[PDB]
Amino acid sequence: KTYEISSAEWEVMNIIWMKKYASANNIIEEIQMQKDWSPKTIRTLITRLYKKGFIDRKKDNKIFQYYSLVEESDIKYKTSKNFINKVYKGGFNSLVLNFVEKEDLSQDEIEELRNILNKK
Template sequence: MNKLPQISEAELEVMKIIWKHPSINTNEVIKKLSKTSEWSPKTIQTMLLRLIKKGALNHHKEGRIFVYIANVDENDYVEVESNSFLNRFYNGTLNSMVLNFLENDKLTDNEINELYQILEKRKNRRKE
């Protein structure tokens, strides 16, 4: 999919369920979202319909139940949204964001160590 549809925060919660459970039916979506939200089944069905209209989801009928499949790849969506976030708040640079978190003590020592290890692994991989 070339251009990703605009997905609201609420719709994103529905997409996360579908990404985690491909080919999931309406009842299963409702059951899973009922555990983490207070949305009514009707609200969830409305969000599913919106996502279909936006092109984020596809569906087909199996018996009397609709089964949903994501048209938007989760990794593609995360990449586009991450870049959008960086551009809006940090002029497109990851360094600015990390520096902001460090300067405002938003990262614990464990998180800093984990980041360091990730960066070291990536650096070593590039040398190979």
């Protein structure tokens, strides 16, 4: 639907959804805080996501600024659903049992998650 998307694309997309509008050079800067990717490798991620229809762009200055054409929450939920079907036999509850049985969740985190369920 909001179709396939690779690990490195998730990173570009995440920067865009958080910043709302971002230039190439912005994306390169943030990406490069945690990744040793060259500008060309990054610029090619922007190019594909633009071609695939995931993001678009306005020309503020003579400078292109990219923005999402995909709803963040929709593509993340769909992705999570493919993932849960792939790994955990199609059960979200299995995922949570696994996580909880294994992380040493702090009381604040426990409470937050309670607050999340209790919101209907």
